[PDB]
């Protein structure tokens, strides 16, 4: 039951095959949940400031027996209204006030608290609220706090093999990226030796860490290597071996297997040999002493008599030393294995490569690298080592980092400490060496299981923590210095650093970005992007290409074509339709479990690590009514290489075709034949819209723009209101229903729309209302309408009819040829508003004053100016006349006989001030729509200014008066009703209020009591109303804070309106562009059989080249819709039967494949049909999925039903000579939209432009009639011309030459036709810079 | 940087010189006009008298009449009432620039 | 460079210099009192350090700034770096008469023209406008001219046009891939907000007239005018000075029409109609004829310059096509009307062009090409040339070819399951099977859209050149090729490469069938790749290029003759199967040494 009342006005034809299950989410969950939690008070300090304060809170004095505690923290409700801040210029920020607890404890008492200041709270700054539309309001502008998506903290088993090796070797590195601290590395060198790296410095010994980590070489080897017993007693030379343990080596000799020699001498190791050897028990079998010589001593043994250091550890056995050991030390000694077939020590080598053998010496080299000098004193190195990684307040990597490493360790738990632990790095090296010898799969970079998109909420939590440390130290310093005080916990309380840091990291950065309000899509997406740029991810856009691939786990994560035209492409990844976020920092995507083939309705949000696990299909499929599968063999994705999967294979089902795309494309029209080249080209032309004069609804889109509007937030949704009262050219008032009414509230909605308001990048963005009156509205319904959309559709555009056919040189490839009609038809006009201002600046030479009394000025210039200088609101602008009329006071004149005679003659001026006035920008003209001004407190001029004050007050006053009247009615009625049944005829209580005869005594008991109570409440309301009135009126003249410089800061705003012109840039959703360059009159537009002067003729010589099969697929549809409207339109023009157009409607909706249920004549009452048609005013709206859209047979079907060429062929008559020509073409009415790069945003010229003060170089680019800078490839080409005179003028005539430009202009006037080069001055500048450097620079003759 | 915007300006007197360059003038005429420009006030009145200018020219051929003729040829070029020379005839030249069609 | 209204902030422009002066003064105060060694040495060390930082901060130490950890740029950091006085300062400066220009497309106004928009004008012409006005005495005063301009008389429009007549300007495109992009051409005043160019130098400026720009160049000196009109003039920029190859040739839909003119399905109305020629315009222009005409006889008076410097006409009675006779009226005298005897294709268009340019002469050939453009610009509409869904018709053999390739794949899989076929053997064989089935289906579709048509005649079967627009496109040769149609017509192809490896499942559908979800997601890797390819490779390309241009900055010829026989030989590269190229171009314009002789001995 599509009640869809606001959509009952106009709906789109659907053909959406697969049925909806879970619709779009709030489409804004992202920039909402995080900041919501950021200012959410939780039971456990687990996120936000709840933990962040819990970090750096308690400061214990320097044994001052003094520690600091706190109770709770508060962030305020507003200072000014959102629009109010928009008006004044203020940052929407709210204070943070935290109760503090400062206790003085008496000495010689164990924490024996003696005195407390557990009563002094600190407002630690004014914090900013994330907006209802998730925006910023700081210092004014509209901004987007773009997040980052970056590498997660944990164990990264780096490869770094191949080309960087430059040695024909595959390397095996080990990368750990902590969230805080430097990095600890266990690198590996070309010498089969590991290398220690930290913070990108010179190599450190691999063994350096372990010995510095109180690990003996004996302990290091006993852990690192496994030692055979090798018990050779009485010179047996026999060792205990397991063929399972070590195998795979050919038996050289002396190979006897518990008596019988199973392995012949010189016999290769066989699996049968190993199996037979394992079959029988093997004791210590005699082995050649040659096996001893290579054997490296495991343990360090000393002689039984002498504790000699003979047979040092990590040393291969020597037969002479073997005899010495077997005679002196013992008979059994630990030896080494290092099965080079399957293992490799790589550790004894670096242990031998280890220069420091003691923990002190090892810890000393660490500082020697860290501090090149300043040798420690055996405490400084120790302290640096312990606080470096064994510290909790210095590295504290991450708890998700803890989970990350623990999973990377397959640790059953995942919650660890951010601090370092020995078993960690030990197993870390174990794994690195293992994979080097081969034990598991190395990690993957561009794959998705390893990254996160770093939000905003914890970013601010972090910035706050960063500040919190910065002041905690000075807190300790003051607690140490002059601690003999019981003062408030405000002694060092300076929140100025806190505010500064929070703002800067937010405000002046690249982390956020000034939000633009181009078309609804600009915000529909620029709140929805993921990129690594910033502090994180890819520190440069350079230095990375591999992750810029199409990543395999990444599908329903980033958008499919959404990446810029240039250097930040491939990496600016656009969140998806099914976007969620992981438990940690990542993002999942909901997924219907294909349970036993049956598709569970349950959607499971799925991300990369999980994504490669179960069995996952594609949706472009039928499913049975039982949920059974259409085909038994279904192509399905299992691990990034999809393939046919059994009906018992696929484990899940996704949501819907929206799985693959975000919306940032999904508002792409019918790409089922669009080229990918066309695809990304098209979307990155899709957002370029700005509104036009009239909104006209797209005829064939995708179907979601209504929903986009539902979050696009530019109109008024109707929260909790029942009946619309007052709608006016800037007001909408609606009175709520009682069932939904919460008592004690007025129960009516007054919503205001901003007309004529420049937007974020200075558009026309006007929310304009919907209904007229006497209308019922449901909850959340849109009634306003911000720009470039109509009656509920995010349409950057509107249907203009067009035809595809080459013609007469206007259609080479890429011209868009529309005829004169739209120029008359206004279809897509422009309206844009840039801002303006003025300043006062009470000076040392004197305050400049806004009086329009510019000396030596013309009245007409002053004529538009009023007494303030504030020109009367509403005038046109053309040229550069002065808008704000200020004058700069100067120093006074002496007796000054010349000036004395002057002031005697004219007087009143004495040149005391100079015309110091503000004017309209050059070449930029128009008329105003509204204005602004900022008077700092301390001046009360208010010249034309009090007018705005008063008008504002009038608005607000009428506003408050409304509720006043309404509740007053409620009460007066309650009274006259109380006077009812008292014999009191309403003739009297109507005759006057009279306090209802001041309780005449009708019951005189409770009526007396009730009357007393009622008069009481009445006066109570009177006072409350007046009180709110007074507070508001105070806010009216409340006054703004200007900088110390300018006394008052008046801000101006105007308008400029544009139509498409010769030279224009329109485009269509099939991504084809056009330079609009020849608008013919109405005649030459090609004439049909009915002659209808068709509108837009394009080149057709490309439909293949970039795959414009979709453009014509539309065009067929577009002609069809114009026709469908034509039929219904004639039907109404006849004023035919109601059920007539009704059957027309039901039939038109009824043809084709089965998608979704819409039906009239049972729901819409007849006028709902009557209007439903009356709106059906040029074509039935129609919507298709991109990847479940309509089939072509449907198009062929539709084209007959309204008598149209299903072929689309139809003749025409030529526009100039009119012979019907061959090629019965196809035409359509495919919507167009306009991008920024305006024709009026282009052209510029100047013949005498500003040669600089510095280098007498050009002013710049049209900046003050500035100009271009020539091109070097071109100039070399010019050398190819040998255009010597051209070069001569280009560097002498066309350089900085004052002495040359002057003579040149003189001759150019004089018709002399010569140029005087002289000598370049930039030459002189460089020659100085040489003489500035250590160079005598001169030129001989 | 060391230069930032680095844009020069007219400062009026050089704007007067810009017109003088396009105006036809002789070497002595250019010297007298330039000297007249040298001692020029912000208000646009002549700082030194015609006699002081004649002394500054230091040419016996340069006389008060030649100085006056040079000043007058440059008196109303840009703007009207430049080099006012004890302003009084300056407002006179300004009104003279206006047409006599204006009443009173 | 003052910032706030208050403080100048020559940071390190003097902050280094000022710190230097300050420490210098402090020293002049201190060591003159027999300075303590620790203090004096530390101070002098700081002095050397700071002076170095002012000259080279980056070598040792650091010269970081207030609130900015970034160091200070020393005196030569105003000499070294990308943005120095050694920034693009061998002539890379901001200029005077140009800027950021939008473009239009010149249906009219042949190459001897250039469409200059009037809006940008006269802010150019202003110095010249004033010069003209004073020469005309239209304002005896410069301020009079300044206001009369601020008045904007239309007599100014007249004066500007009169100047705009005999004064061309120069035009250019930016990322100057050549000396070929920039044009000097006959500027003309026009009304709007874009400048129009003839469909000619569309190659020269080398962009494509969508959201883009061109440039305005004011040849101030008369020598500049003469040179550009003689050098920067595109009136000669035909042959690729490198390739020798005529860059200038209509290759857009003007060709499509040129083809549509000379064709014949089987035999059009009165195909036996025959004439002498001047009235063919009357007949086909009146009725009774189509460009679809066959066997129309025509008395043709071809001329050959067989006489030395003299052309002799020669009248034949050749049978030709309707548009053939037409464009025969277009051509000048020399070419055999056998030049008109063609199916008249793109390469042929170029070819006739070449034959002429070798044959006649420069103004002649240019005028010929120009009117060629003119005639095409007429015909394409006189064609128009619809497009539509059905011109995509898939040959039916696709379904069976798919079934067969699937059978082959299933056989390979079952063999691998039996263990007889190795998985890699299965892969290579399956790749072969898929490639073969792809070739088969490709042939099937191509036949479906090759020159394949049944038409009415006496025999009732005249399989002729068909009439689908796309196949005609691949044929005559304007925009696309067979590969384009096939992907839109045959399956998507293998295209199986996430990065380099061959994905087993091939993308099997055409633009006719749409695609699949996994299909599109597959299609994205190579697309973003290729875009990024143009992206990053432009970089190394330009780097090498500048490397070269520097490496060739001084190259010139200063001598005419060397008087030397030394050299290397020019011989064919009969390389691989044969000669990749004949040894014809490599010495086409050659001057062999004294070593040239006939194959005969002493010959």
What is the residue-wise DSSP string for A35-97?
Answer: HHHHT---SSS-SHHHHHHHHH---B-SSSSEEEEEEEEEE---SS-HHHHHHHT---EEEEE
Residue B2 sits at the chain C interface (C-beta within 8 Å): yes
CB-closest option in B4, B9, B43 to A911: B43
Whether the CA torsion A1212, A1213, A1215, A1219 is positive or negative: it is positive
Burial A6-29 (b: 16+ CB within 10 A, else e): bbebbbbbbbbbbeeeeebeebbe
Neighbours of A1157 (CB within 10 A): 9
A1100 contact residues in C (CB cutoff 8 A): 385-387
| CA–CA dist A381, A377 (Å, integer) | 7
| CA–CA dist A446, A552 (Å, integer) | 9
Contact A1258 C135 (CB under 8 A): no
3-state DSSP assignment of residue A359: helix
Instruction: Tell me the pairing of strands A1227-1228 and A802-804.
Output: antiparallel
Nearest chain C residue (CA) to A549: C525
Burial A1251-1268 (b: 16+ CB within 10 A, else e): bbebbbbbbbebeebbbb
A906 contact residues in B (CB cutoff 8 A): 91
A791 φψ region: left (φ > 0), alpha (ψ -120 to 50), beta (else): left
Looking at domain A714-788, its CATH class is: mainly beta
| CA–CA dist A919, B38 (Å, integer) | 31
Instruction: Enumerate the H helices of C221-264 as residue ranges.
Output: 222-230, 254-261
Look at the block and give the residue holding tokens 């456990």.
A44
| A814's tokens | 């890429």
Instruction: Enumerate the H helices of C34-184 as residue ranges.
Output: 37-56, 126-135, 142-151, 154-165
A1322 contact residues in B (CB cutoff 8 A): none
Q: Does domain A576-656 have CATH number 2.30.150.10?
A: yes
Say how many Å lie between the first and final Cα of chain A, rounded: 96
| C111's tokens | 């190459």
Looking at domain A940-1039, its CATH architecture is Helix non-globular (6.10)
Contact A806 C520 (CB under 8 A): no
For this PDB entry, the determination method is: cryo-EM
CB-closest option in B4, B42, B88 to A905: B88
Which A residues 563-592 touch C at CB under 8 Å? Answer: 563, 566-567, 569-570
| CA–CA dist A1155, A1020 (Å, integer) | 60
C211 contact residues in A (CB cutoff 8 A): 1065, 1073, 1075, 1235, 1237
| Side-chain half-sphere exposure of A124, counting CA atoms within 13 A | 25
CA angle, A535 then A536 then A538, to 5° = 115
What does the domain layout of chain A look like in residue ranges?
26-152+445-575, 153-225+344-444, 226-343, 576-656, 657-713+789-828+1059-1242, 714-788, 829-939+1040-1058, 940-1039, 1257-1341
What dihedral angle (degrees, nearest 10) is formed by the CA atoms of B14, B19, B25, B30?
Answer: -10
Angle, helices A1272-1281/A1284-1291, rounded to nearest 10 degrees: 140
Q: How far is CA A229 from CA A294, A334, A900, C173, in A?
A: 16, 5, 118, 81
Tell whether residue C210 is among the known ligand binding residues: yes
Among residues A753, A775, A756, which one has the least CA distance to residue A765?
A756
Which B residues 47-86 touch C at CB under 8 Å? Answer: 78
Tell whether residue C562 is among the known ligand binding residues: yes
| CA–CA dist A596, A608 (Å, integer) | 23
Look at the block and give the residue holding tokens 């040239």.
C596
| Side-chain half-sphere exposure of A845, counting CA atoms within 13 A | 12
| CA–CA dist C586, C597 (Å, integer) | 19
Look at the block and give the residue holding tokens 């003579």.
A1303
| C161's tokens | 């046009």
CB-closest option in B3, B21, B88 to A901: B88
Nearest chain B residue (CA) to C144: B77
Instruction: Tell me the pairing of strands A1182-1183 and A700-701.
Output: parallel
Q: Is the peptide bond before C71 cis (omega within 30 degrees of 0)?
A: no
Among residues C221, C119, C208, C239, which one has the least CA distance to residue C170?
C221
| CA–CA dist A659, A22 (Å, integer) | 12
Whether the CA torsion A568, A571, A577, A582 is positive or negative: it is negative
Under 8 Å CB pairs connecting chains B and C tally to 13
Q: Does domain A153-225+344-444 have CATH number 3.40.50.720?
A: no
| CA–CA dist C590, C596 (Å, integer) | 11
Helix (H) or strand (E) holding A731: strand A731-735
| CA–CA dist A1153, A715 (Å, integer) | 35
What dihedral angle (degrees, nearest 10) is formed by the CA atoms of C257, C262, C267, C269?
Answer: 70
- Measured in whole angstroms, the distance separating CA C254 from the mean position of its chain's CA atoms is 17
Helix (H) or strand (E) holding A1017: helix A1006-1036
| C56's tokens | 């080279």
| CA–CA dist A410, A407 (Å, integer) | 4
A1246 touches A1267 (CB < 8 A): yes
3-state DSSP assignment of residue C593: coil
Among residues C501, C492, C509, which one has the least CA distance to residue A549?
C501
Helix (H) or strand (E) holding A835: strand A835-839
3-state DSSP assignment of residue C188: strand
Q: What is the CATH topology of the domain spanning A829-939+1040-1058? A: OB fold (Dihydrolipoamide Acetyltransferase, E2P) (2.40.50)
3-state DSSP assignment of residue A323: helix
Among residues A536, A186, A773, A1246, which one has the least CA distance to residue C121?
A1246
Residue B17 sits at the chain A interface (C-beta within 8 Å): no
Which C residues 63-82 touch B at CB under 8 Å? Answer: 78
Among residues C445, C491, C493, which one has the least CA distance to residue C470?
C445
B3 contact residues in C (CB cutoff 8 A): 1
| CA–CA dist A1309, A1323 (Å, integer) | 29
Look at the block and give the residue holding tokens 């109509």.
A790
A886 touches A917 (CB < 8 A): yes
| CA–CA dist A501, A494 (Å, integer) | 13
Q: A714-788 and A829-939+1040-1058: same fold?
A: yes
| CA–CA dist A1211, A130 (Å, integer) | 59
| A237's tokens | 């030379």
| A493's tokens | 């309380």
Look at the block and give the residue holding tokens 């079998």.
A285
Instruction: Enumerate the H helices of A280-412 as residue ranges.
Output: 290-294, 319-328, 348-353, 359-370, 380-389, 399-408
| CA–CA dist A466, A501 (Å, integer) | 9
B1 contact residues in C (CB cutoff 8 A): 1, 13, 78
| C410's tokens | 């299933």
Contact A1302 B21 (CB under 8 A): yes
Residue C391's φ and ψ, nearest 5 degrees, are -55, -20
Tell whether residue C212 is among the known ligand binding residues: yes
For chain B, the DSSP string reads: --STT-B---TTHHHHHHHHHHS---HHHHHHHHHHHHSB-TTSSBSS-HHHHHHHHT-SS--HHHHHHHHHHTTTSSSSS-S-SSSSHHHHHHHHHS-TTS--
A764 touches A714 (CB < 8 A): no
| CA–CA dist C211, C207 (Å, integer) | 10
Among residues C38, C79, C37, which one has the least CA distance to residue C56?
C79
CATH number at C389-537: 1.10.132.30
Biggest CA pair distance of chain B = 58
Residue B98 sits at the chain A interface (C-beta within 8 Å): no
| CA–CA dist A731, C266 (Å, integer) | 73
C107 touches A808 (CB < 8 A): yes
| A587's tokens | 């993002």
Q: What is the CATH topology of the domain spanning A657-713+789-828+1059-1242? A: 2.40.270
C257 touches C376 (CB < 8 A): yes
DSSP state of A642: -
Angle, helices C254-261/C469-476, rounded to nearest 10 degrees: 100
Q: How far is CA A313 from CA A299, A316, A317, A350, in A?
A: 6, 9, 10, 13
Which class for C315: exposed (0-12), middle (13-18), buried (19 or more C-beta within 10 A)? exposed
| CA–CA dist A879, A859 (Å, integer) | 16
3-state DSSP assignment of residue A1225: strand
CA angle, C393 then C398 then C401, to 5° = 165
Residue C253 sits at the chain A interface (C-beta within 8 Å): yes
The 3 state secondary structure assigned to C413-432 is HHHHHHCCCCHHHHHHHHHH
| CA–CA dist C378, A1187 (Å, integer) | 41
CA distance B79 to chain C (A): 11
For A1285-1316, the DSSP string reads: HHHHHHHTTTSS-HHHHHHHHHHHHHT-----
C210 contact residues in A (CB cutoff 8 A): 814, 1073-1075
CA distance A1265 to chain B (A): 13
Helix (H) or strand (E) holding A888: strand A886-889
Neighbours of C319 (CB within 10 A): 17
A1239 touches A1061 (CB < 8 A): yes
Residue A1276 sits at the chain C interface (C-beta within 8 Å): yes
Q: How far is CA C183 from CA A814, A1274, C200, C204, in A?
A: 21, 11, 11, 7
Which class for A232: exposed (0-12), middle (13-18), buried (19 or more C-beta within 10 A)? buried
Bridge partners (DSSP) of residue C240 are C245
């Amino acid at each position: 039951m599509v009640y869809s009342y606001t959509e009952k006005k106009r709906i789109r034809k659907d053909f959406g095959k697969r049925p909806q299950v879970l619709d779009v989410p709030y489409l804004l969950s992202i920039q909402l949940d995080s900041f919501q939690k950021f200012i959410e008070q939780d039971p456990e300090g687990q996120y936000g400031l709840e933990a962040a304060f819990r970090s750096v809170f308690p400061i214990q004095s320097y044994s001052g027996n003094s520690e600091l505690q706190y109770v709770s923290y508060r962030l305020g409700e507003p200072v000014f209204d959102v629009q109010e801040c928009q008006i004044r210029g203020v940052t929407y920020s709210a204070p943070l006030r935290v109760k503090l607890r400062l206790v003085i404890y008496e000495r010689e008492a164990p924490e024996g608290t003696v005195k407390d200041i557990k009563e002094q709270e600190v407002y630690m700054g004014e914090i900013p609220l994330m907006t209802d539309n998730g925006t910023f309001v700081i210092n004014g502008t509209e901004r987007v706090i773009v997040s980052q998506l970056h590498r997660s903290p944990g164990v990264f088993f780096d490869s770094d093999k191949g080309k960087t090796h430059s040695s024909g070797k595959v390397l095996y590195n080990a990368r750990i990226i902590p969230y805080r601290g430097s990095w600890l590395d266990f690198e590996f060198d070309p010498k089969d030796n590991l290398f220690v790296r930290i913070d990108r410095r010179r190599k450190l010994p691999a063994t350096i860490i372990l010995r510095a980590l109180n690990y003996t070489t004996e302990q290091i080897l006993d852990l690192f290597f496994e030692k055979v017993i090798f018990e050779i007693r009485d010179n047996k030379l026999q060792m205990e071996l397991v063929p399972e343990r070590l195998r795979g080596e050919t038996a050289s000799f002396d190979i006897e297997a518990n008596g019988k020699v199973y392995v012949e001498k010189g016999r290769r190791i066989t699996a049968r040999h190993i199996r037979q050897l394992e079959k029988d028990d093997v004791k210590l079998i005699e082995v050649p002493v040659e096996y001893i010589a290579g054997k490296v001593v495991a343990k360090d043994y000393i002689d039984e008599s002498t504790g000699e250091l003979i047979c040092a550890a990590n040393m291969e056995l020597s037969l002479d030393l073997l005899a010495k050991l077997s005679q002196s030390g013992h008979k059994r000694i630990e030896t080494l294995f290092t099965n080079d077939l399957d293992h490799g020590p790589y550790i004894s080598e670096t242990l031998r490569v280890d220069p420091t053998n003691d923990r002190l010496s090892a810890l000393v080299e660490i500082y020697r690298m860290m501090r090149p000098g300043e040798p420690p004193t055996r405490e400084a190195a120790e302290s640096l080592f312990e606080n470096l990684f064994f510290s909790e307040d210095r590295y504290d990597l991450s708890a998700v980092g803890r989970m990350k490493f623990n999973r990377s360790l397959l640790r059953e738990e995942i919650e660890g400490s951010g601090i370092l632990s020995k078993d960690d790095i030990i197993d870390v090296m174990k794994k690195l060496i293992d994979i080097r010898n081969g034990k598991g799969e190395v990690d993957d970079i561009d794959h998705l299981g390893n990254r996160r998109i770093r939000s905003v909420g914890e970013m601010a939590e972090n910035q706050f923590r960063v500040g919190l440390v910065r002041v905690e130290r000075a807190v300790k310093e003051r607690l140490s210095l002059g601690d003999l005080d019981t003062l408030m916990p405000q002694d060092m309380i300076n929140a100025k650093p806190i505010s500064a840091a929070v703002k800067e990291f937010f405000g002046s950065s690249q982390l956020s970005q000034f939000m633009d309000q181009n078309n609804p899509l600009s915000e529909i997406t620029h709140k929805r992007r993921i990129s690594a740029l910033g502090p994180g991810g890819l520190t440069r856009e350079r230095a990375g290409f591999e992750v810029r691939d199409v990543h395999p786990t990444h599908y329903g994560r980033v958008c499919p074509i959404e990446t810029p035209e240039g250097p930040n492409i491939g990496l600016i990844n656009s969140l998806s339709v099914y976007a969620q976020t992981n438990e940690y920092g990542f993002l999942e995507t909901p997924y219907r479990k294909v349970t036993d083939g049956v598709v569970t309705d349950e959607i499971h949000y799925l991300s990369a690590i999980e994504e490669g696990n179960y069995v996952i299909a594609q949706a472009n499929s039928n499913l049975d009514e039982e949920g059974h599968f259409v085909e038994d063999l279904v192509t399905c994705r299992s691990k990034g290489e999809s393939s046919l999967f059994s009906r018992d294979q696929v484990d899940y089902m996704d949501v819907s075709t929206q799985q693959v795309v975000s919306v940032g494309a999904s508002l792409i029209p019918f790409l089922e034949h669009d080229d990918a080249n066309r695809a990304l080209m098209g979307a990155n032309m899709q957002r370029q819209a700005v509104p036009t004069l009239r909104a006209d609804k797209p005829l064939v889109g995708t179907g979601m723009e209504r929903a986009v509007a539902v979050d696009s937030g530019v109109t008024a949704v109707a929260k909790r209101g029942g009946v619309v009262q007052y709608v006016d050219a800037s007001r909408i008032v609606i009175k709520v229903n009682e069932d939904e009414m919460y008592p004690g509230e007025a129960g009516i909605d007054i919503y205001n729309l901003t007309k004529y308001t420049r937007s974020n990048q200075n558009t026309c963005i006007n929310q304009m209302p919907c209904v007229s009156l006497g209308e019922p509205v449901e909850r959340g319904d849109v009634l306003a309408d911000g720009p470039s959309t109509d009656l509920g559709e995010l349409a950057l555009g509107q249907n203009m009819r067009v035809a595809f056919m080459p013609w007469n040189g206007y259609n080479f490839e890429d011209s868009i040829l529309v005829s004169e009609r739209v120029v008359q038809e206004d279809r897509f006009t422009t309206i844009h508003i840039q801002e303006l201002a003025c300043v006062s600046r009470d000076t040392k030479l004197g305050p400049e004053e806004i009086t329009a009394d510019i000396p030596n000025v013309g009245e007409a210039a002053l004529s538009k100016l009023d007494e303030s200088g504030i020109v009367y609101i509403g005038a046109e602008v053309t040229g550069g006349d002065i808008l704000v009329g200020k004058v700069t006071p100067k120093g006074e004149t002496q007796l000054t006989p010349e000036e004395k005679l002057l002031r005697a003659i004219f007087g009143e001026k004495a040149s005391d001030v100079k015309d110091s006035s503000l004017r309209v920008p050059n070449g930029v003209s128009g008329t105003v729509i509204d204005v602004q001004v900022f008077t700092r407190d301390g001046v009360e001029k208010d010249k034309r200014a009090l007018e705005i004050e008063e008008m504002q007050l009038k608005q607000a006053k009428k506003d408050l008066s409304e509720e006043l009247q309404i509740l007053e009615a409620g009460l007066f009625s309650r009274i006259r009703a109380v006077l009812v049944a008292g014999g009191v005829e309403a003739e009297k209580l109507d005759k006057l209020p009279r306090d209802r005869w001041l309780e005449l005594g009708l019951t005189d008991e409770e009526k007396q009591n009730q009357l007393e109570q009622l008069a009481e409440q009445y006066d109570e309301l009177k006072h409350e109303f007046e009180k709110k009135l007074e507070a508001k009126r105070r806010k009216i003249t409340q006054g703004d804070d200007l900088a110390p410089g300018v006394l008052k800061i008046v801000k101006v705003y105007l308008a400029v309106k544009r139509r498409i012109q010769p030279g224009d840039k329109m485009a269509g959703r099939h991504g084809n562009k056009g330079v609009i360059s020849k608008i013919n009159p109405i005649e030459d537009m090609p004439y049909d059989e009915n002659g209808t002067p068709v509108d837009i003729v394009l080149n057709p010589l490309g439909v293949p080249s970039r795959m414009n099969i979709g453009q014509i697929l539309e065009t067929h549809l577009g002609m069809a819709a114009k026709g469908i409207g034509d039929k219904i339109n004639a039907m109404l023009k006849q004023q035919q039967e109601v059920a007539k157009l009704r059957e027309f409607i039901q039939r038109a909706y009824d043809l084709g494949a089965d998608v979704r249920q819409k039906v009239d004549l049972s729901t819409f009452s007849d006028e709902e049909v009557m209007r439903l048609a009356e709106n059906l005013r040029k074509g039935m709206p129609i919507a298709t999925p991109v990847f479940d859209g309509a089939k072509e047979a449907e198009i062929k079907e539709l084209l007959k039903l309204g008598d149209l060429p299903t072929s689309g062929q139809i003749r025409l008559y030529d526009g100039r000579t009119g012979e019907q020509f061959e090629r019965p073409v196809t035409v359509g009415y495919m919507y167009m939209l306009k991008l920024n790069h305006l024709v009026d945003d282009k052209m510029h010229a100047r013949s005498t432009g500003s040669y600089s003060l510095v280098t007498q170089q050009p002013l710049g680019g049209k900046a003050q009639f500035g100009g271009q800078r020539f091109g070097e490839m071109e100039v070399w080409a010019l050398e190819a011309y040998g255009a010597a005179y051209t070069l001569q003028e280009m560097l002498t005539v066309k350089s900085d030459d004052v002495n040359g430009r002057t003579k040149m202009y003189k001759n150019i006037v004089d018709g002399n036709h010569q140029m005087e080069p002289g000598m370049p001055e930039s030459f002189n500048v460089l020659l100085k810079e040489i003489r500035s450097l250590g160079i005598n620079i001169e030129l001989e003759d | 940087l060391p230069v930032y915007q680095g844009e020069t300006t007219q400062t009026l007197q050089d704007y007067l010189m810009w017109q003088v360059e396009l105006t036809p003038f002789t070497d002595t005429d250019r010297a007298i006009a330039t000297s007249i420009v040298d001692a020029v006030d912000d208000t646009g009145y002549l700082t030194i008298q015609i006699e002081d200018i004649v002394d500054s020219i230091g040419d016996d051929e340069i006389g008060l009449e030649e100085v006056e003729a040079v000043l007058k040829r440059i008196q109303r070029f840009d703007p009207v009432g430049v080099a006012a020379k004890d302003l009084r005839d300056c407002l006179l030249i300004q009104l003279s620039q206006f047409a006599k069609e204006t009443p009173w | 460079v003052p910032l706030d209204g208050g403080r100048f902030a020559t940071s390190d422009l003097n902050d280094l210099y000022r710190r230097v002066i300050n420490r210098n003064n402090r020293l002049k105060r201190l060591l003159d009192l027999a300075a303590p060694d620790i203090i004096v040495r530390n101070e002098k060390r700081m002095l050397q350090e700071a002076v170095d930082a002012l000259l080279d901060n980056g070598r040792r130490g650091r010269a970081i700034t207030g609130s900015n950890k970034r160091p200070l740029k020393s005196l030569a950091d105003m000499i070294k770096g990308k943005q120095g006085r050694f920034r693009q300062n061998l002539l890379g400066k901001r200029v005077d008469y140009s800027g950021r220009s939008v473009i239009t497309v010149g249906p009219y106004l042949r190459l001897h023209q250039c469409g200059l928009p009037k809006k940008m004008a006269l802010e150019l012409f202003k110095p010249f406008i004033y010069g003209k006005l004073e020469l005309r005495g239209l304002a005896t005063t410069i301020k009079a001219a300044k206001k009369m301009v601020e008045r904007e008389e239309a007599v100014v429009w007249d004066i500007l046009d009169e100047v705009i007549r005999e004064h061309p300007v120069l035009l250019n495109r930016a990322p100057t891939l050549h000396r070929l992009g920039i044009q000097a051409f006959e500027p003309v005043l026009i009304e709007g907000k874009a400048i129009q160019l003839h469909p000619l130098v569309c190659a020269a400026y080398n962009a494509d007239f969508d959201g883009d720009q061109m440039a305005v160049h004011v040849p101030l000196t008369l020598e500049a005018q003469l040179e550009a009109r003689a050098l920067m003039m595109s009136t000669n920029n035909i042959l690729s000075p490198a390739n020798g190859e005529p860059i200038i040739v209509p290759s857009q839909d003007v060709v499509l029409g040129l083809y549509y003119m000379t064709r014949d399905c089987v035999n059009a109305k009165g195909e036996g109609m025959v004439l002498t020629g001047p009235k063919e315009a009357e007949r086909l222009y009146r009725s009774g004829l189509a460009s679809l005409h066959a066997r129309v006889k025509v008395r043709i008076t071809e001329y050959e310059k067989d006489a030395n410097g003299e052309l002799v006409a020669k009248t034949s009675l050749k049978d030709t096509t309707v548009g053939r006779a037409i464009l025969w009226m277009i051509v000048p005298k020399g070419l055999p009307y056998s030049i008109v005897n063609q199916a008249l294709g793109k390469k042929a268009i170029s070819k006739m062009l070449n034959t002429c340019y070798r044959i006649l002469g420069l103004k002649p050939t240019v005028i010929f090409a120009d009117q060629i453009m003119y005639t095409g610009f007429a015909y394409a509409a006189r064609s128009g040339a619809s497009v539509g869904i059905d011109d995509m018709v898939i040959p039916e053999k696709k379904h069976e070819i798919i079934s067969e390739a699937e059978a082959e794949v299933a056989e390979i899989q079952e063999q691998f399951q039996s263990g007889l076929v190795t998985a890699g053997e299965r892969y290579n064989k399956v790749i072969d099977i898929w490639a073969a089935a792809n070739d088969r289906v490709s042939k099937a579709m191509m036949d479906n859209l090759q020159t394949e048509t049944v038409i009415n005649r006496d025999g009732q079967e005249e399989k002729q050149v068909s009439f689908n627009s796309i196949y005609m496109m691949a044929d005559s040769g304007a925009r696309g090729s067979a590969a384009q149609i096939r992907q839109l017509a045959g399956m998507r192809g293998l295209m199986a490469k996430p990065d380099g490896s061959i994905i087993e499942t091939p993308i099997t559908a055409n633009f006719r069938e749409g695609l699949n979800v996994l299909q599109y997601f597959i299609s994205t890797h190579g697309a973003r790749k290729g875009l990024a390819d143009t992206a990053l490779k432009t970089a190394n390309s330009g780097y090498l290029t500048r490397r070269l241009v520097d490496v060739a900055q001084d190259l010139v010829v200063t001598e005419d003759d060397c008087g030397t026989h030394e050299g290397i030989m020019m011989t064919p590269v009969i390389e691989g199967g044969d000669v990749k190229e004949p040894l014809r171009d490599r010495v086409l314009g050659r001057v062999t040494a004294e070593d040239v002789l006939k194959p005969g001995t002493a010959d």
